[PDB]
Design an enzyme around this catalytic site. Structure first.
Site, mmCIF file in Angstrom:
data_model
loop_
_atom_site.group_PDB
_atom_site.id
_atom_site.type_symbol
_atom_site.label_atom_id
_atom_site.label_comp_id
_atom_site.label_asym_id
_atom_site.label_seq_id
_atom_site.Cartn_x
_atom_site.Cartn_y
_atom_site.Cartn_z
ATOM 1 N N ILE A 29 16.266 14.336 -43.640
ATOM 2 C CA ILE A 29 15.089 13.747 -43.961
ATOM 3 C C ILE A 29 14.343 14.119 -45.250
ATOM 4 O O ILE A 29 13.381 13.567 -45.465
ATOM 5 C CB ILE A 29 14.021 13.746 -42.609
ATOM 6 C CG1 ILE A 29 13.770 15.163 -42.500
ATOM 7 C CG2 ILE A 29 14.753 13.062 -41.617
ATOM 8 C CD1 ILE A 29 13.098 15.492 -41.145
ATOM 9 N N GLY A 30 14.908 15.172 -45.972
ATOM 10 C CA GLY A 30 14.232 15.449 -47.265
ATOM 11 C C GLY A 30 14.837 16.823 -47.881
ATOM 12 O O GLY A 30 15.137 17.578 -47.239
ATOM 13 N N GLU A 31 14.760 16.662 -49.239
ATOM 14 C CA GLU A 31 14.919 17.837 -50.042
ATOM 15 C C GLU A 31 13.584 18.332 -50.420
ATOM 16 O O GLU A 31 12.555 18.011 -49.904
ATOM 17 C CB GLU A 31 15.822 17.285 -51.482
ATOM 18 C CG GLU A 31 16.343 18.445 -52.032
ATOM 19 C CD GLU A 31 17.945 18.481 -51.598
ATOM 20 O OE1 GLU A 31 18.640 17.364 -51.458
ATOM 21 O OE2 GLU A 31 18.353 19.755 -51.259
ATOM 22 N N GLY A 32 13.694 19.335 -51.472
ATOM 23 C CA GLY A 32 12.382 19.869 -51.830
ATOM 24 C C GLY A 32 12.713 20.990 -52.646
ATOM 25 O O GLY A 32 13.711 21.514 -52.765
ATOM 26 N N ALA A 33 11.654 21.215 -53.392
ATOM 27 C CA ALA A 33 11.696 22.571 -54.299
ATOM 28 C C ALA A 33 12.012 24.010 -53.669
ATOM 29 O O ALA A 33 12.505 24.699 -54.083
ATOM 30 C CB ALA A 33 10.688 22.550 -55.226
ATOM 31 N N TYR A 34 11.521 23.802 -52.249
ATOM 32 C CA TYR A 34 11.743 24.937 -51.340
ATOM 33 C C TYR A 34 12.785 24.927 -50.564
ATOM 34 O O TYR A 34 13.119 25.980 -49.738
ATOM 35 C CB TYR A 34 10.303 24.902 -50.786
ATOM 36 C CG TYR A 34 8.950 25.094 -51.650
ATOM 37 C CD1 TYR A 34 8.464 26.285 -51.903
ATOM 38 C CD2 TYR A 34 8.430 23.782 -51.706
ATOM 39 C CE1 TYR A 34 7.391 26.381 -52.652
ATOM 40 C CE2 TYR A 34 7.249 23.766 -52.532
ATOM 41 C CZ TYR A 34 6.876 25.154 -53.235
ATOM 42 O OH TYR A 34 5.687 25.101 -54.030
ATOM 43 N N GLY A 35 13.505 23.923 -50.070
ATOM 44 C CA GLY A 35 14.538 23.791 -49.541
ATOM 45 C C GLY A 35 14.674 22.289 -48.879
ATOM 46 O O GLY A 35 13.775 21.529 -49.061
ATOM 47 N N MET A 36 15.445 22.211 -47.863
ATOM 48 C CA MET A 36 15.969 21.162 -47.083
ATOM 49 C C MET A 36 15.313 20.938 -45.956
ATOM 50 O O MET A 36 15.471 21.848 -44.879
ATOM 51 C CB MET A 36 17.443 20.809 -47.056
ATOM 52 C CG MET A 36 18.071 19.745 -46.558
ATOM 53 S SD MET A 36 19.866 19.506 -46.639
ATOM 54 C CE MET A 36 19.796 19.391 -48.579
ATOM 55 N N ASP A 46 -5.020 24.287 -50.457
ATOM 56 C CA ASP A 46 -4.207 22.989 -50.880
ATOM 57 C C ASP A 46 -4.548 21.663 -49.961
ATOM 58 O O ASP A 46 -3.354 21.234 -49.715
ATOM 59 C CB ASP A 46 -2.826 23.498 -51.407
ATOM 60 C CG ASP A 46 -2.035 22.507 -52.350
ATOM 61 O OD1 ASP A 46 -2.739 21.755 -53.005
ATOM 62 O OD2 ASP A 46 -1.088 22.612 -52.071
#
Ligand SMILES: Nc1nnnn1NCc1cccc(OCc2ccccc2)c1
Length: 342
Positions: free
Chosen positions: A22-29, A140
């Site tokens: 459901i998603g990648e990311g700069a922090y992981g999957m 944030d």
């Protein structure tokens, strides 16, 4: 072997089955998965942080905070999966409730009713009250960090940039770099603040409220200083009283160099908006952080009268308190995640 996803190992069995990307990311999957124990679908994120001291620090910070908070409007950790020994631990899997959407995706596609706006805002403030009562700043807050399920329950997430409040150490020079998301930064960040006081979260909530009223960001700066000019163009030039609060000369003289701008009245920007919502918006988006409303006053505002109930708005049991090499951080992450073993 272990189930795999999009060319990568997702080693979470046996409790968790039937994965979907459901998603990648700069922090992981991120994958969704079936919890064979509770017979529900959950979300699981794979993080691999141990090669970088910076990811290690953010990871550990967020784990400690989320394990200590227990609140309906703050995302919880259901489970943490990792190898049984520090030598074998290369990844950590975090298990959370599966959330349908977030406020960012919702605003791109849906018009919100005044009832939804009011209910969403109440839940944000209810969760923020608990957070601030623990002496923590989120720092944030933005629509993509507010998750929603299919019945519009809202949970605050992403405590990676969170700090313990430190008002005595908040002062800094003009144009000091900041890491939180540009559009939702309080003006004092660009002028004289490190963002170590509660007032910076209230500013971000005011931006989110404006964005819910119109489906677009109210101060979409292109860059560090453009952000400030977007703010003053709507709020107008600060008064002498508010300038006298800025003692650093570089910051004060920059503001004095600008052309005079008058305030644009909220009801001209948002003609459809409930007038009580605009009165609260005004008090959240105040230039001077010392005059900005606090979270408990915002909850008691007439806009929120059908929800406000201080006996059902819990505070934390005790305030929260916390340069390390990554080897020691890895050891600390190993120790914090032990309670979810075997
Ligand atoms: N909960 C949720 N539903 N859809 N997406 N989504 N969450 C993004 C996400 C899912 C699963 C675990 C996540 O945790 C990330 C985290 C990283 C470091 C420390 C604590 C938690 C994040």
């Amino acid at each position: 072997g272990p189930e795999m996803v999009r060319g990568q190992v997702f080693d979470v069995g046996p409790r968790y089955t039937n994965l979907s990307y459901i998603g990648e990311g700069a922090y992981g999957m991120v994958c969704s998965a079936y919890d064979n124990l509770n017979k529900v679908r959950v979300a699981i994120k794979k993080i691999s942080p141990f090669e970088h001291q910076t990811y290690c620090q953010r990871t550990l910070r967020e784990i400690k905070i989320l394990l200590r908070f227990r609140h309906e409007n703050i995302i919880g950790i259901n489970d943490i999966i990792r190898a049984p020994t520090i030598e074998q631990m290369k990844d950590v899997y975090i298990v959370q409730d599966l959330m349908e959407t977030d406020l960012y995706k919702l605003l791109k596609t849906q018009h919100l009713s005044n009832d939804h706006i009011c209910y969403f805002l109440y839940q944000i403030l209810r969760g923020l009250k608990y957070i601030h009562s623990a002496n923590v700043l989120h720092r944030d807050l933005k629509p993509s960090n507010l998750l929603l399920n299919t019945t519009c329950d809202l949970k605050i997430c992403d405590f990676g940039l969170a700090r313990v409040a430190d008002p005595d150490h908040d002062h800094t020079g003009f144009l000091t770099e900041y890491v939180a998301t540009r559009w939702y930064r309080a003006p004092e960040i660009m002028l004289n603040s490190k963002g170590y006081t509660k007032s910076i979260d209230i500013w971000s909530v005011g931006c989110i409220l404006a964005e819910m009223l119109s489906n677009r960001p109210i101060f979409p700066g292109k860059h560090y200083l453009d952000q400030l000019n977007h703010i003053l163009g709507i709020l107008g030039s600060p008064s002498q009283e508010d300038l006298n609060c800025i003692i650093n000369l570089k910051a004060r003289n920059y503001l004095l160099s600008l052309p005079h701008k008058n305030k644009v009245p909220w009801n001209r920007l948002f003609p459809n908006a409930d007038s009580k919502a605009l009165d609260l918006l005004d008090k959240m988006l105040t230039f001077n952080p010392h005059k900005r409303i606090e979270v408990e006053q915002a909850l008691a505002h007439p806009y929120l009268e059908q929800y406000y109930d201080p006996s059902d708005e819990p505070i934390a049991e005790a305030p929260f308190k916390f340069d390390l090499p990554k080897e020691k951080l890895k050891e600390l992450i190993f120790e914090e995640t032990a309670r979810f073993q075997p």
